[PDB]
Symmetry: C3
Subunit: 456 residues, 3 copies
């Protein structure tokens, strides 16, 4: 058969699996081997967004699951353990496996059990693996997917960096950024109406202090999966071009494209050469996913400017919003303090500072100064101080028509921002009230809930 290089030789190899966004070393081998893969399913609560918990079902404790790297022609002895704390049974289907279910019917594993099966890796390429346990959609939606690379016999060309990025669509009972432990929502999942669309299992998984890194002149290979369960990614890099895009083990290689479609369950290898420094954004260019549901990752390039190629500046909160900053840990802290009943004004101020970036600063500026006669100030604002309840109604329901702020007329339009949750409005307004010589005090989530329930 194609990809059959005879029986395993050398010694059995225990596969080294890596957590996203890292990749195991190149196999660097000229002979087929028996490769033993041990992967454990863990069900666990993790933060899908700041102050938002979700019960993920994982291969190896992460979303996506542990990266597996083997060579075409290898005999793979696959061990699937299900942690005793699990409530559900699980299995695995690996794309690129030649056999019914890609392993599913020989990997069915109850909590506290282990299964094994063996396959020959006949098909070179990058492949999605996922759980295949009824109801399959629920298992994939909860995070049960990852990538397996089957290298060609001669290996992939050498690059400076290899990274592991996987998109998924997620379905919570609550709205986007609604705090608390969020249940899986079967109705949204069947309707293909996700609340979150993420790289690597969380908002901000690959932004700020968790960005991917390279230097000017270096090559970067990214193994890009789409776990779905339902969405097709218009996968794109802002401000750069892919030297190459190869899907699964396909013979076709596209070169010099910026935007590529990755099917649900699909995988691609992309290659990038870093030319000028700054932040390069990976997005799903179905744009509300990227900028309203979490589908943004950063590759930060360090090194010398080249003004002959690009004269301009690094991104900030205008483009990246509240993900320009290293993290939003203050939001997590304020949500934990609300639960404990120890929420301070300063907890709200720091959370609001984080959330004000982009969301409000695009028009009002990072210092609240606005732009005289165009965008009114929030700094030392008489209009704000005069009526904090009115300010709650402005954030939720918008504002238009002639107003006077700090002695100047404005005649413009502030769009409604109803998608902000009650805690987010409360924290942003508490931040503004405690900044820039404003009168202090605080707005509570309960205050905003009342205004939302009866607009002015």
């Amino acid at each position: 058969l194609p990809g059959d290089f005879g029986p395993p030789r050398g010694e059995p190899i225990h596969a080294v699996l890596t957590s996203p966004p890292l990749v195991p070393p190149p196999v660097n081998r000229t002979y087929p081997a028996k490769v033993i893969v041990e992967l454990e399913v863990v069900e666990k609560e993790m933060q899908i967004s700041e102050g938002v918990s979700y019960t993920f079902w994982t291969f190896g404790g992460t979303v996506p699951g542990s990266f597996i790297r083997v060579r075409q022609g290898d005999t793979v002895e696959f061990h699937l353990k299900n942690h005793p704390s699990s409530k559900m049974p699980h299995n695995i289907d690996l794309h690129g496996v030649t056999g019914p279910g890609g392993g599913a019917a020989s990997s069915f594993t109850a909590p506290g059990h282990e299964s094994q099966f063996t396959f020959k890796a006949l098909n070179e390429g990058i492949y999605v693996y996922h759980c295949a346990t009824a109801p399959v959609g629920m298992h994939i939606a909860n995070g049960m997917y990852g990538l397996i690379l089957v290298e060609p016999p001669e290996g992939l060309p050498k690059v400076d960096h290899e990274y592991y990025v996987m998109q998924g669509d997620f379905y919570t009972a609550g709205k986007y950024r609604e705090k608390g432990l969020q249940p899986f929502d079967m109705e949204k999942a069947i309707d293909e109406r996700p609340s979150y669309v993420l790289f690597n299992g969380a908002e901000g998984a690959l932004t700020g202090d968790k960005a991917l890194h390279a230097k000017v002149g270096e090559t970067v290979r990214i193994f890009v999966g789409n776990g779905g369960p339902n969405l097709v990614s218009s996968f794109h890099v802002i401000g750069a071009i892919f030297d190459q895009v190869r899907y699964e083990g396909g013979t076709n290689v596209q070169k010099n494209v910026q935007t590529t479609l990755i099917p649900a369950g699909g995988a691609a290898v992309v290659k990038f050469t870093a030319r000028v420094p700054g932040s390069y954004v990976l997005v799903d260019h179905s744009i509300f996913r990227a900028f309203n549901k979490g589908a943004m990752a950063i590759l930060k390039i360090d090194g010398a400017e080249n003004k002959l190629v690009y004269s301009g500046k690094e991104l900030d909160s205008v483009e990246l919003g509240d993900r320009a900053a290293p993290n939003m840990s203050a939001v997590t802290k304020a949500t934990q303090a609300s639960v404990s009943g120890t929420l301070t004004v300063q907890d709200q101020v720091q959370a609001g500072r984080a959330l004000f970036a982009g969301t409000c600063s695009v028009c009002h500026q990072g210092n609240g100064a606005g732009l005289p006669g165009v965008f009114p100030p929030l700094a030392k604002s008489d209009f704000l101080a005069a009526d904090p309840k009115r300010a709650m109604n402005i954030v939720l329901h918008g504002l238009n028509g002639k107003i006077k702020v700090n002695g100047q007329e404005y005649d413009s339009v502030m769009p409604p921002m109803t998608q902000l949750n009650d805690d987010e409005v409360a924290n942003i307004l508490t931040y503004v009230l405690n900044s820039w010589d404003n009168p202090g005090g605080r707005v509570s989530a309960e205050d905003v809930k009342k205004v939302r329930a009866q607009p002015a």
Copy 2:
């Protein structure tokens, strides 16, 4: 012009059209011909799912419509009849036709009439045809699509089997698996929110006893259409790889891929070589389509195991759910008995037996034994027998926390299953009650409707 090999020669040929999933023989001809195609539109009720009727609008009595096979350079004299029982007018647009509407304006046909037009098949490839009558979306949604193959002059390479598979999205007033004659739902169609996503016009059209067949070592070509009207298919084969994928008459051929995107209105030729026995699942890998809306088809391969390639087992209800079994004819029978007012306990038991597979057996086992201390038993269950109403509430609304069943503690989570219809819950629980030394009796759809309307 390209594809013009001069005037028709030989004798006029009456085209032999085939019903899905079969394909007409290769044209096996070295000269261009006059090919006469006769296709009749029939509007008729058929079962879209067990006990679920739908008024399909068809080309030739099937969804997809009759397969048409001609040679590049042929002169095609196309006759479209509209059966006198039809209520709507119809026409045809064939992709690959050079001319306005692909035939639409010269094929407009009232009930009881016939139209004809002639075209030269200049463009080799596989092409969708469909109705193009206002409102076009409603006509396509009701089933009016099929494939035309225009062979290259030398013919396609020989294979062991050729099959015809076409995806469609469907829009019923009722929910998925809600029984009765279901009207078309224009609102769901405009919103692109299908209730069913199917291969060949019905749930189970290509599963169980209707699976496609081949043997180890054989080649299979599948002509794959996407009628839409609205969805793009992440078309995938579980447990295998496509040797080749060619779209329409494109010059590009992708080789060695498992997952491919087929546009709405698009068509592809895929080729598969059978290597090891078992069930190979064709799916839309937008996974809730495949596992919650009907988008699964089976190619069953018979022949010798090859343990060096794959050591594992054939699929069962864990992966295929209630489509692992040859058919679900008991569901059809119980739905007909409910309508007639002759529904017996045994009718409910056999329907429930069919629906229990995967849906319940993944956790509770096919024999209801569960797994001591992990998944509680439904076999001889004291907890079930103690309160059948509570069991209805468990299926609809789920269960969590500590319980005692047959003297053993469980402390786990059963997800809600609200997407099951009242008749499905009633039949599954009647099956369980009449199995495994349980106390018998019955649950009615009306019993479940009351519990659904007021949870415990």
Copy 3:
């Protein structure tokens, strides 16, 4: 670097930008230049459909924005002005730019300001540009996208015509064809549930008297963008085939395909050779977009028939519906008259005449004659005249079962048409009542609103 042909030579060039659907001339240059691009953002109300206003945000006063044409290796000095009448700040991200944000962070521009940045056009291809100002999705949804062509050094092959077509998804508070000034709807946008899907910013932007034109034997190149923000286009030409399809600056060229997937944010160059006369329809083959949300454009080919290739007729209202006619200006006029409180019967009759095409004429004929015993007449209809309120209920809610019209029995089905707005039903029925020896009078939108609120 690739695409670097040294410093600019010759004289600085002021780029000539074109409004859709036209393209600037080929650069026709053998040396790299300094190209100065001046583009102004304008926020303005325009008609998205007849009698439906929308506040678009534009690059250069149009949707899509002004077409930019440069040569690979050019140094581009990009000037972005924001008109003083603007309420929002804006910026630009050009795909194909090597640098963070594709220009976004160096083009941020308040109302009444100007920004500039310089880049080297290293990457040949066709590229989307768009606004990248928080909230990015809202800016793109309001129309802020266009195309930039970076020619290869030797230029593109010569063709007879070059056109500029760009798809977008739009999100109004009101339903499709609901009259008035329609606000942007953030909720529909986040849910990816557009009310309109358009080429070039309006229904009918490229139909009727605004169709694209060519002659038999000519070559046509179309630069096709997908601004999104959210949808992927199953981009298709009815009745023809693309000689070539190239995405962005990709090395891959597909040849001889009819249906291609364009990602959100993607762009392609397609080439068509005109073979036989008539209307060739560009659509998103996610068919409810094309036939229920506005996603249809026409290339009209003039010249000699070739009966050996295609024996049939030009399209009419069966396929193109109310877009077969040169325009629907009567709908705009009646909507303006309703607002002014000067709506005449004749205003309603002319609007209804426009809306009757396809919507009603597919079954009842353009002259209201129907087809004896199959489709009842609206011409001199006793049944219509007997009860105009019943006729309102028939349009909204459908009709089935045995009726008698003009002495003949019908036993058929007219589907409900609830998606028609109150003014559309009122105008269509006023047209019918004032035609074909019917009794005249008028139906008002308020009459239809009452019937819709309580069906018979």
